[PDB]
Amino acid sequence: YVELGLPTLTVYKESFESQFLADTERFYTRESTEFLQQNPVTEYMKKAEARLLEEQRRVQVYLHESTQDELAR
Amino acid sequence: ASYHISNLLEKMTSSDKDFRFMATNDLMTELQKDSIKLDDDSERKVVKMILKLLEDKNGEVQNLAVKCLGPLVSKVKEYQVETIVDTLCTNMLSDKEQLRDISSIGLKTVIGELPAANVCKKITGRLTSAIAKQEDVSVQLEALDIMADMLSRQGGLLVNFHPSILTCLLPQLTSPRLAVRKRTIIALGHLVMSCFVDLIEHLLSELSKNDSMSTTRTYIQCIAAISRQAGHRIGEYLEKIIPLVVKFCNVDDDELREYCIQAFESFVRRCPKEVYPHVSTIINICLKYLTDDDMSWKVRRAAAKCLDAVVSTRHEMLPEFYKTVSPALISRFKEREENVKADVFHAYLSLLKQTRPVGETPLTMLQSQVPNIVKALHKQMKEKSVKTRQCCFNMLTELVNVLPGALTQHIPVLVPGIIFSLNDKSSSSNLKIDALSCLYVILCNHSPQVFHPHVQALVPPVVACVGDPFYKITSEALLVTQQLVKVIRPLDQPSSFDATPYIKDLFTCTIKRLKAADIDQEVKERAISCMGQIICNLGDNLGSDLPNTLQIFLERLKNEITRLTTVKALTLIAGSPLKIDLRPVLGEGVPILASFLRKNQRALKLGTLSALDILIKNYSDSLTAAMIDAVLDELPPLISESDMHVSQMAISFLTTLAKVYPSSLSKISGSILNELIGLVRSPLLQGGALSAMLDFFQALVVTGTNNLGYMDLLRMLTGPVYSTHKQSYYSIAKCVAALTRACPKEGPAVVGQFIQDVKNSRSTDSIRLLALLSLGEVGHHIDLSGQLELKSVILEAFSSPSEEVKSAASYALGSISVGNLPEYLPFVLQEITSQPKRQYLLLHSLKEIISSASVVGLKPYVENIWALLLKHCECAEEGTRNVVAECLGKLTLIDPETLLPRLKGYLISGSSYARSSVVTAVKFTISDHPQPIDPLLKNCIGDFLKTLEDPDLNVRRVALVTFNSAAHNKPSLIRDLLDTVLPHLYNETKVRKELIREVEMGPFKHTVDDGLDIRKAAFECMYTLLDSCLDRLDIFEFLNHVEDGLKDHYDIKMLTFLMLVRLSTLCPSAVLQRLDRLVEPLRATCTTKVKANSVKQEFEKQDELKRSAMRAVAALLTIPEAEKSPLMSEFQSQISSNPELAA
């Protein structure tokens, strides 16, 4: 997706980045909503830290660098 | 301008104090705020004038000049700074004491202002001769103070002058004056932090050679000070310090204090040591050393305090502590003066804190040793000192907190002590507060049965404590009264106690506090909570005061201060076994509670919703319409996708209202229904809230109302679809299934859905998908075996151009089979073998049935399903193999005892495909939450991992994947098998030159590697091991392999960089020992160049790898003591761009 569209990332943003960000937002919102109901905030803090670390690992392993600043935001 | 400076300089010599003070203040405030264009001659005159004014005969002018000297040196040429420093230095040696003090203060101010290098060098050169052993004690003191301040302010510079500083400081340790010794000890401690690395060796050698001579406590104090200020550096000398100190433990002179302190400091700072029993015995024997007139008490204090470091710092020595005399002597030794008793009690508090959890467990030993502590506390409770009683109460509270129920047989002896402490007049407020807290903690953490005989002896003290002008004690008494009320009349257990004689008093002490009349807010809240608890528990015994006191609840509801407390009290009162008559109050309360929904308070919203729900549930025969629409007027705002919890509570309230009051169900046809429909299609809709809505729908369908029938609901639900997210389709299907379940006589609906699904003409993909989902959801509960044309149309829907319809048909094929397994399961089982062009969706449907069907109903067909899966294990298609393995793994969950041996026995002679399927199937059995199969998996994972770690390539890959999944999900299974598995992983983490097949075409090359996947899986396992399995592993055997993988394939390079970044924070010392061999590959990564004539993408692909290496080395540079620079200062034009991009 980076190679096509001739770095130019028009195809990458139009096809993959936006949808991936939308599903990430929906999944994280649902996870936070379902976790805050039963378990207390003390475990939610550790879960949030672990999720942030996992997302950083994913974005630095198999995602483009241009998504590093947006997703972490 | 120059004229202003000239006139200030002229007036500075007016011989009049007021003129001399105003001009100096003006000069200071002008220099403090951006002095403009000050010519060099002006600097000269200003410096000379200030230096002369420092010798003036009035203190005010000298002090103002001293303060002004600071902001002056901010902006002056360096030569004036040098001459000012020189003048201060020579004035410091003047005979006049005022000049010495003024110069010292000025030099201290200059040093504090300075953040520059030559000034400090000159000052140090002067002070080195100043501190030398001369006949002026005051000059030595001032020079020592100045050098100590300079070292504290900055120590990075003066690297070459440190040996001279040490050489001048060392002889001062034997000076007759003790103040000189203390000051030079402080100076040496400050100097140690700055240093270079060699100087500590000479300092330690000098201390060691001085100690083995005519000794003095000054050397021991200096050793303790430098060890406190620098712990890690002096660790290597622990073997050469302890025996010499121990040799001095037998001196009759009372110098054991210093030894005890340096031991305490060492244990606080330096944890690695193996001489604990000897020092523990020394401390124990020194603790009982007694033989105001005799000075033998600070030794006991130090000995008792030293045990605190041992107890708190060490956690793995708890059984050793409990079994030895560590707590036994402390419990026995509780009769001493106030300070020693207090510090011993603090040590025992630390011991109890360490006992708190993160054959003979520490809790069991503490329980066994409880009686001695109880006897000691009972004996110590008769003292007249409030501090001892406070310490005893803290001990009791901590002992109850660490383990509940410990004080079960000790209540009859502990209660008299608490009663005496509460009834004593000399007791302070703090003692009463902590005694009440301890009593509350004991009552809350023990059975009510043991407290019954003492109930007569516990009520008058608490009642007296209620009537106290101090509000804190009153609040504590109310808190204790709540637990007393709970204990005397429990509702979850049968009790024969008669609490009637204690009723009125408990009311009398409370109702007066209920009428606040400008009292503390916390007192109001506690009184309201206690009054509500009294209503909930002892309402029957109350007479005619209930209607009068019920209005106070409304009054406390009116104001904002106690809204939440009153709401909680009313909710507790409503939900009680005793049906309290709240009807007279409910009529006024309901509108007030409903009005609270408008304001944006989440906690208040939830509280008032729960209160309304419980009130309408308990009381349904006293409701009027007006309160109903008053409550429902604010519901539509509360139903939104933004807040799922509030929507769920509103749905539950609506369901309860429909259940109890179905008459007023015609007012929800407006905005409420629209909001509910909008929430139905919300993608975030999930969880029990969804279920709640389903329940609500069912209830409504049970009631029956105009424009709210089954057909109207179906039309409203399926309007937009028949005329976008998949979760909306699933929610609509579930709602349709629930509505169908509400009315069993709905046969035509299924046939209509069948006609809609089978009619190809004028049918969109969305309509077919919705119909398939609805049919699958409906058939999940009710039987559809008597209806024909199902299997034919479902199998026809498999051949569709859209994958959504294919997935929906595959899911819905086995959904009806859940209701009727015997008719449908053999059909799909036979269709799997009969038709090979659709067996993928058939296997998916079979997996769905296995996941969904009941275990007791699926037991008879387990053998057939297992036989079919084993026959289909060897297939040409990979996806079919994965589906079969997943089905086997899910089937393994049920009846594991019978079938786990069967999968166990296939490892002996199974084929490569069979072994791979077996390893893959067990992967799906591991779950994050605990499962009943956990011990079996723990006991049989050993051969799945160890014995089958290198039969072949694909088997190795699947075994590594299973190990990674197990480590990520349940590390406990592989916690004890790391030792026998890690060498195999390290073997897997090596490059092999037999699976690299190079394909060459002209001047171009294309390397193809087969075992990249195995290495990547091994590296992923290694990365996952850091999360929870990092403590029990050899760090070097991980770091050398990390270095080896640093030069691996491009994909693994980023993972290795991430591992290096993670290890930068975790265990910095191990990285420090390997910082020289962890950068050379990282330096090659930032230097490598690619051959020309390559594609443009090949040019940019190193442009992220080099950036990642730059980030990794930048993270590695964050180690506090990573000062070593392996030719790092090589920044040409191209490389230097990367720093700022990384930052």
Curated annotation (Swiss-Prot), chain A:
Post-translational modification: Neddylated; which enhances the ubiquitination activity of SCF. Neddylation prevents binding of the inhibitor CAND1. Neddylation leads to structural rearrangment in the complex that allows interaction between the E2 ubiquitin-conjugating enzyme and the acceptor ubiquitin. Deneddylated via its interaction with the COP9 signalosome (CSN) complex.
Protein encoded by which gene: CUL1
Complexes and interactors: Component of multiple Cul1-RING E3 ubiquitin-protein ligase complexes commonly known as SCF (SKP1-CUL1-F-box) complexes, consisting of CUL1, SKP1, RBX1 and a variable F-box domain-containing protein as substrate-specific subunit. Component of the SCF(FBXW11) complex containing FBXW11. Component of the SCF(SKP2) complex containing SKP2, in which it interacts directly with SKP1, SKP2 and RBX1. Component of the SCF(FBXW2) complex containing FBXW2. Component of the SCF(FBXO32) complex containing FBXO32. Component of the probable SCF(FBXO7) complex containing FBXO7. (Microbial infection) Interacts with Epstein-Barr virus BPLF1.
Family: Belongs to the cullin family.
Role: Core component of multiple cullin-RING-based SCF (SKP1-CUL1-F-box protein) E3 ubiquitin-protein ligase complexes, which mediate the ubiquitination of proteins involved in cell cycle progression, signal transduction and transcription. SCF complexes and ARIH1 collaborate in tandem to mediate ubiquitination of target proteins. In the SCF complex, serves as a rigid scaffold that organizes the SKP1-F-box protein and RBX1 subunits. May contribute to catalysis through positioning of the substrate and the ubiquitin-conjugating enzyme.
Taxonomic superkingdom: Eukaryota
Name of the protein this chain belongs to: Cullin-1
Full-length numbering of the shown residues: 208 to 289 of 776
Tissues where the protein occurs: Expressed in lung fibroblasts.
Domain notes: The Cullin neddylation domain restrains the RING domain of RBX1 in the E3 ubiquitin-protein ligase complex; this restraint is removed upon neddylation of the cullin.
Curated annotation (Swiss-Prot), chain B:
Residues found modified as Phosphoserine: S496
Any one biological process term the GO annotation gives: negative regulation of catalytic activity
Keyword Methyltransferase: no
Gene, per the UniProt record: CAND1
Keywords, comma-separated and alphabetical: Acetylation, Cytoplasm, Nucleus, Phosphoprotein, Repeat, Ubl conjugation pathway
Other comment: A model has been proposed to explain the mechanisms of cullin-RING E3 ubiquitin ligase complexes assembly. According to this hypothesis, cullin-RING E3 ubiquitin ligase complexes exist in a 'stable' active state when saturated with substrate, occluding access to deneddylation by the COP9 signalosome (CSN) complex. The neddylation-conjugated cullin-RING E3 ubiquitin ligase complexes mediate ubiquitination of substrates and can recruit downstream factors involved in substrate degradation.
Functional summary from the UniProt entry: Key assembly factor of SCF (SKP1-CUL1-F-box protein) E3 ubiquitin ligase complexes that promotes the exchange of the substrate-recognition F-box subunit in SCF complexes, thereby playing a key role in the cellular repertoire of SCF complexes. Acts as a F-box protein exchange factor. The exchange activity of CAND1 is coupled with cycles of neddylation conjugation: in the deneddylated state, cullin-binding CAND1 binds CUL1-RBX1, increasing dissociation of the SCF complex and promoting exchange of the F-box protein. Probably plays a similar role in other cullin-RING E3 ubiquitin ligase complexes.
Induction: Repressed by miR-148a.
GO MF term list: TBP-class protein binding
Species per Swiss-Prot/TrEMBL record: Homo sapiens (Human)
PANTHER family: TIP120
Pfam family, one: TIP120
GO terms under cellular component: cullin-RING ubiquitin ligase complex; cytoplasm; cytosol; extracellular exosome; extracellular region; ficolin-1-rich granule lumen; Golgi apparatus; membrane
Localization annotation: Cytoplasm; Nucleus
Protein name in UniProt: Cullin-associated NEDD8-dissociated protein 1
Self-association and partners: Interacts with TBP. Part of a complex that contains CUL1 and RBX1. Interacts with unneddylated cullins: interacts with CUL1, CUL2, CUL3, CUL4A, CUL4B and CUL5. Does not bind neddylated CUL1. Interaction with cullins is abolished in presence of COMMD1, which antagonizes with CAND1 for interacting with cullins. Interacts with ERCC6. Interacts with DCUN1D1, DCUN1D2, DCUN1D3, DCUN1D4 and DCUN1D5; these interactions are bridged by cullins and strongly inhibits the neddylation of cullins.
HEAT repeats: 1-36, 41-78, 80-115, 120-154, 160-195, 196-232, 233-267, 320-357, 362-405, 409-448, 453-490, 501-540, 544-581, 584-621, 626-663, 667-706, 708-741, 742-778, 785-822, 823-860, 861-893, 894-931, 935-972, 976-1030, 1032-1066, 1073-1122
Residues bearing the modification N6-acetyllysine: K52, K904
Entry's family note: Belongs to the CAND family.
Residues passing through the membrane, by range: none
SUPFAM superfamilies: ARM repeat
